[PDB]
Amino acid sequence: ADLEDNMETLNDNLKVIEKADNAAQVKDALTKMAAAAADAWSATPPKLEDKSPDSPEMHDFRHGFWILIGQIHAALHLANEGKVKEAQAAAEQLKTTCNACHQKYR
Amino acid sequence: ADLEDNMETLNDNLKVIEKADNAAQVKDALTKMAAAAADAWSATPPKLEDKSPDSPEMHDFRHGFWILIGQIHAALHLANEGKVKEAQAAAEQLKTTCNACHQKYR
Amino acid sequence: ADLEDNMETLNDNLKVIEKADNAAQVKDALTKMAAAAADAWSATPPKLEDKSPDSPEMHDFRHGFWILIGQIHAALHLANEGKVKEAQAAAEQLKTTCNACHQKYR
Ligand code: HEM
Ligand code: HEM
Ligand code: HEM
Ligand SMILES: [Zn+2]
Ligand SMILES: [Zn+2]
């Protein structure tokens, strides 16, 4: 997918999570987030087009999606286990990851 | 691209790390491995074609490559600071993750 | 080698990061944490001595351990970038992962 569509999917589904009624809905938003973050991994952002793929910038760029995928995964488990409230909390906190990569490369 | 191709890339570069000349050939081969493993992220292996993308088997499957990439990133950091022998050792012990997944899904 | 020992190394270097002045001191302490975590993550802890390597309990433990490994990586990136203060904030931010895993498995 386009990086840009991948982020819309991240943004949209996080909101779906903040507003969810039950576990089924959070878990579904999390899955979709996982899909998008997995796909984004290999993307080159506009701000790093003049950067070599094996370069520190692209290295740290990729790692951002690694972290996010692990967090979504942890959060996805809380959801599977029916823990709506804490799943929503994990979901929240992975925003720090969105910001960390955003501050730098967006 | 293909799951098959990704594995050939994995296998080849593991041999490339074992024979490595210097830090850079080690780093370059590890980079290729991470990109191949992330390409495989969302591939669907023959043995799990009957299984829902939301099943424990696929969960287990995608998670392997996440562990792997992590292990690769860790080796990469060893190489970055010029501990080639140590980076080469982690690429050896990195086979435990390969095997773990083949055992279940190949 | 053993969990205990690596956990001390982990504990001690976080207090070294909190008391650090320069980016290099943070980088080294994070590097020692990287190393402790590299040698620890696959151990079975006292409280899961009964459960086997591929249960839900060991899978969760390994993941949170990998989350931790991934936050040390992020923090190490920030240090190489010489962003001293935000490497430290990231070393702080990683106490929650420490805590999430102790709360289930210590
Ligand atoms: C779930 C967490 C995340 C959310 C909610 C999020 C949200 C967004 C949104 C809404 C945009 C569009 C901004 C615009 O309208 O111009 C965007 C763009 C972007 N994001 Fe994220 N993001 C997340 C995680 C990440 C991560 C982890 C990375 C890097 C590893 C990243 C890298 C980027 C980049 C480079 C752009 C610019 C896209 C472009 O200009 O083509 N984002 N993100
Ligand atoms: C760097 C470590 C790894 C190496 C060197 C490696 C190597 C290989 C090789 C040589 C094959 C032979 C199949 C062929 O080429 O036709 C294969 C197949 C396969 N591997 Fe891996 N592998 C690794 C890691 C993994 C991991 C981590 C997973 C799961 C997370 C995995 C899942 C599979 C599956 C499902 C197949 C069978 C697919 C097919 O035949 O279409 N492998 N691998
Ligand atoms: C920076 C992060 C962490 C710090 C500073 C830390 C610190 C410590 C300390 C001080 C101990 C007690 C050691 C002793 O008195 O022998 C300990 C033990 C332990 N830690 Fe951590 N820890 C961290 C992260 C983690 C993580 C991520 C996990 C699992 C994923 C984990 C699992 C355990 C377990 C199971 C023990 C019990 C060992 C025993 O008493 O046998 N820790 N840790
Ligand atoms: Zn899991
Ligand atoms: Zn790195």
Side-chain angles (χ1 to χ4, degrees), chain B:
Chain B
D2 256 345
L3 218 212
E4 300 194 353
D5 293 327
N6 294 327
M7 299 296 151
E8 137 246 287
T9 302
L10 258 10
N11 206 52
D12 284 16
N13 290 95
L14 229 27
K15 296 179 212 295
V16 166
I17 291 148
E18 169 196 29
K19 281 148 199 287
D21 24 338
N22 65 171
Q25 267 223 137
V26 163
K27 298 188 340 213
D28 173 76
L30 277 172
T31 296
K32 285 166 188 174
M33 292 190 62
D39 206 49
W41 268 168
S42 59
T44 310
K47 258 89 180 308
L48 304 184
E49 288 163 316
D50 47 316
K51 288 276 155 188
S52 162
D54 301 332
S55 65
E57 289 94 320
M58 290 301 291
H59 157 321
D60 222 324
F61 184 66
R62 296 186 278 260
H63 193 270
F65 298 110
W66 191 79
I67 297 272
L68 187 64
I69 284 162
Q71 287 182 283
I72 293 166
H73 194 157
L76 196 50
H77 288 176
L78 286 183
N80 282 170
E81 303 300 331
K83 306 177 171 296
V84 179
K85 283 292 227 126
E86 298 197 48
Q88 295 178 116
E92 262 288 300
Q93 210 131 301
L94 182 152
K95 297 172 152 146
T96 319
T97 304
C98 312
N99 295 157
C101 184
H102 298 147
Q103 237 150 260
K104 284 158 124 179
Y105 307 126
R106 182 169 87 174

Side-chain angles (χ1 to χ4, degrees), chain C:
Chain C
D2 80 356
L3 256 203
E4 210 130 6
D5 284 345
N6 286 318
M7 292 295 157
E8 285 316 283
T9 307
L10 249 19
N11 186 40
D12 292 330
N13 285 95
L14 208 35
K15 292 165 168 167
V16 169
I17 292 156
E18 298 177 7
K19 301 162 180 266
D21 285 301
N22 69 60
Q25 272 148 181
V26 183
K27 182 183 178 159
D28 176 65
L30 289 168
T31 306
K32 280 157 169 126
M33 297 176 71
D39 169 57
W41 82 265
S42 72
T44 322
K47 249 57 195 267
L48 297 181
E49 256 146 14
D50 63 350
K51 308 289 163 177
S52 95
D54 298 345
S55 44
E57 293 91 332
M58 284 291 284
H59 164 71
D60 209 69
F61 179 95
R62 278 157 191 236
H63 198 261
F65 226 123
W66 279 102
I67 302 218
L68 187 79
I69 294 155
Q71 297 177 322
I72 297 160
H73 291 171
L76 212 44
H77 290 185
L78 285 165
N80 305 172
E81 286 152 21
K83 266 93 148 282
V84 184
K85 298 277 204 208
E86 56 242 64
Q88 290 176 318
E92 262 293 306
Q93 199 222 319
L94 121 198
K95 289 182 180 173
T96 318
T97 323
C98 308
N99 294 151
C101 181
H102 294 162
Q103 287 166 196
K104 315 173 113 63
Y105 302 125
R106 191 175 172 224

Side-chain angles (χ1 to χ4, degrees), chain A residues 19-98:
Chain A
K19 287 170 218 158
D21 286 315
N22 59 45
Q25 295 175 194
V26 170
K27 179 217 307 209
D28 256 70
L30 279 172
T31 296
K32 291 167 197 286
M33 287 180 84
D39 189 81
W41 202 83
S42 43
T44 309
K47 242 85 162 291
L48 299 173
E49 259 148 18
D50 52 0
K51 293 307 191 158
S52 168
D54 71 341
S55 67
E57 284 77 17
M58 280 295 278
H59 169 71
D60 177 54
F61 188 73
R62 293 197 289 276
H63 192 239
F65 296 107
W66 202 89
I67 279 153
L68 195 66
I69 282 154
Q71 315 185 116
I72 280 168
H73 200 97
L76 204 50
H77 270 291
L78 300 168
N80 269 154
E81 295 179 13
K83 276 100 153 271
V84 196
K85 275 279 181 162
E86 46 207 289
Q88 275 179 131
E92 251 323 95
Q93 278 160 198
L94 71 196
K95 286 180 172 186
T96 292
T97 307
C98 311

Side-chain angles (χ1 to χ4, degrees), chain A residues 3-4 7-8 10-11 14 33 45-46 61 64-65 68 97-98 101-102 105-106:
Chain A
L3 222 214
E4 34 288 322
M7 296 293 147
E8 293 307 290
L10 264 0
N11 168 84
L14 206 41
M33 287 180 84
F61 188 73
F65 296 107
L68 195 66
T97 307
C98 311
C101 173
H102 282 171
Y105 302 123
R106 184 220 225 163

